[PDB]
Design a protein around this ligand. Sequence first.
Ligand code: GDP
Ligand code: UDP
Ligand code: GLC
Ligand code: MG
Ligand code: MN
Ligand code: NH4
Ligand code: NH4
Ligand code: NH4
Ligand code: NH4
Lengths: 179, 541
Amino acid sequence: DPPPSETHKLVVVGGGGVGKSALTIQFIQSYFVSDYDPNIEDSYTKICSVDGIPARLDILDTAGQEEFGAMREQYMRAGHGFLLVFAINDRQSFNEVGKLFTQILRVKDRDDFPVVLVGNKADLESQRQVPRSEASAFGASHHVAYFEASAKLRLNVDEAFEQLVRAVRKYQEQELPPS
Amino acid sequence: MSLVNRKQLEKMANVRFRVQEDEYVAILDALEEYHNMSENTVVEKYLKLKDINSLTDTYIDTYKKSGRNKALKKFKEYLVIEILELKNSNLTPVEKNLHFIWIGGQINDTAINYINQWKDVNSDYNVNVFYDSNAFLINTLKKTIIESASNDTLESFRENLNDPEFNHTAFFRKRMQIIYDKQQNFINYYKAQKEENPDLIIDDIVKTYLSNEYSKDIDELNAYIEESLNKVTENSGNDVRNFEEFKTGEVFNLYEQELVERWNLAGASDILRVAILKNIGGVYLDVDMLPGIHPDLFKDINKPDSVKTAVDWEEMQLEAIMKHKEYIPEYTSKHFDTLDEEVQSSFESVLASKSDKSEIFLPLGDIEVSPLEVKIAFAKGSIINQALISAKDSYCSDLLIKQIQNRYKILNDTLGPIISQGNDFNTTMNNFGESLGAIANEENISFIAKIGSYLRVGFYPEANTTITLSGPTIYAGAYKDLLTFKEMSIDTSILSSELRNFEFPKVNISQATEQEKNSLWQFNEERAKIQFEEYKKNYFE
Ligand SMILES: Nc1nc2c(ncn2[C@@H]2O[C@H](COP(=O)(O)OP(=O)(O)O)[C@@H](O)[C@H]2O)c(=O)[nH]1
Ligand SMILES: O=c1ccn([C@@H]2O[C@H](COP(=O)(O)OP(=O)(O)O)[C@@H](O)[C@H]2O)c(=O)[nH]1
Ligand SMILES: OC[C@H]1O[C@H](O)[C@H](O)[C@@H](O)[C@@H]1O
Ligand SMILES: [Mg+2]
Ligand SMILES: [Mn+2]
Ligand SMILES: [N+]
Ligand SMILES: [N+]
Ligand SMILES: [N+]
Ligand SMILES: [N+]
């Protein structure tokens, strides 16, 4: 008698090498292996329980910095919500997430689309290039949750994806007619 | 006995004071048929469950608010479980073929040495090394045109070397524009020459093209063709051009699209291996795969605390076997050498005590499988088509063929007419992106987003389209197809919970090999930046 499971399309975006695949694979299957990137099937799905409500999550990882707007647009049509990933040891990857935020709002046509910001590779604190305060200020200024995560140690991996489901649910409830 | 009988379903979907509708009796009749198909093939029982499922959907669609729908939806679940009971209960012998593929160029000594480990401990298996005798020069054409395109791009960076603009992204993007112009120049040359003289084989057109346009010597080329043809025939060579079921099949043109036009040998090999399973049956293996290590070989050596994944532990053991037995010369030991003295000596001790290679690598022996299924390897818990098992003509092998046809129909129908208007890379890509957006819907948008990088495959970082068109994704498609009684599913959303039913047994393979970490078709951001500094350092210093 409980409501049928919701299905959510989540897109993990950010520069190439920031750890989108590593985060996604850790979230789905709890595997991480350094120096081992097999060309596995990339259509990641998982049944999830968030605040005691199950949801089916289809997760789509983007490829690299995509140059062509038409191609980047197809990735953004696909997302009901976005995991916006940079690596804390790579200010250039942090620079890229500011750009992707603009595009997401432009393509969904909102000020407040479900987005969770992730500074990945928290294990590499000794090589930090973006201060935690500067990243979490970028989060607070756009009303998106910020998690410092490590796919390598499986730190905040479940927490960040679960928070993105919360933001999607809350946004979709607010969007019910009349808006 | 597994699935409910007619009387069980009748009480499950019982509604008081409701007529037995014709569409409802049709389900009961079909389910009664199914329980008396003692004598039929596994495939005929599956097709019957397909009918039952299809009649159940017809009922639910006709009486959308019927009190029977809750029980019929639970009956539908029971049909899916019964697929798996049918799969598990009726096994057939797997043909004793080990199939490998090396196409587009001369087979390397490293490929041979891996294949020999399989051959040595599976003397009851026929070994095939599938190659294409018409197409030994594709790897030389690709390498030449990439080298030419790199040279042009590095020269155009003459005196902007230390600007921030001229980084690895700027290089690969402008080199890709030049590659596209060059690749199309060849493709239009191949298309024109084939049309005019259909007796020309691929290498006849490629060597003429390399001597004309890139001043290569036709005699080194002809000697290379001769060297390459003699090496594969000495090592179980099985010529694709003698594969008649393949050549006259539905997907041979797609195989040649990847081989001749895309210079994607991994993509061509993805397609050929499906035809191999469908028409011949056996075990398929990528040439970077090694036999399963004998589970009793290292039972007495505890994994050190330093080694934190199963992949790292397998890699240690493979390296240990190769350092002390030297079965594969030049096989790295960089990981094994970091282990403690005591552990290294323990490996040496155990390996010195073994004489028979079959005590190191586990012989496959007799394998049996459902006539429905293709089994597939798992890596980090996701499927990867680097290892497959199928009896000849399996139901899934046919679903895989339909997966390839549909995916290339969407791709070729969409990108082809855009390529044909003869604009450069950037114009072609933007138009392709707009054409893809125009056909996208919720069902296919994941696929649509993953095929935009098609023209970049092999030439640009993170161009992974091959996974989606011909590789692991088609197997997620075919398994979804089988478990939903559908065909050509383009939304490949499926849980590992379902895919684990089709897993290639981990005991019959070692995936954590040296060659598996060096992909021959794609490369990541880090590799691109490493390439860029070496490209520059070589061009100048
Ligand atoms: N130390 C560390 N390395 C990571 C982490 N996540 C990913 N990496 C590494 O960064 C590289 C790129 O990761 P990948 O998942 O392919 O990033 P993508 O290009 O965004 O998909 C790989 O070598 C990963 O092992 C992390 O949390 N910590
Ligand atoms: O020049 C080539 C490159 C690749 N392949 C085929 O493509 C397969 C896949 O190559 P690889 O293992 O690099 O792909 P990955 O597993 O990295 O996706 C090989 O085993 C071969 O069958 C080939 O025949 N010739
Ligand atoms: O491992 C076998 C591989 O062949 C090629 O690489 C394909 O891109 C991929 O589908 C698969 O991973
Ligand atoms: Mg990736
Ligand atoms: Mn491989
Ligand atoms: N029955
Ligand atoms: N039917
Ligand atoms: N493994
Ligand atoms: N099979």
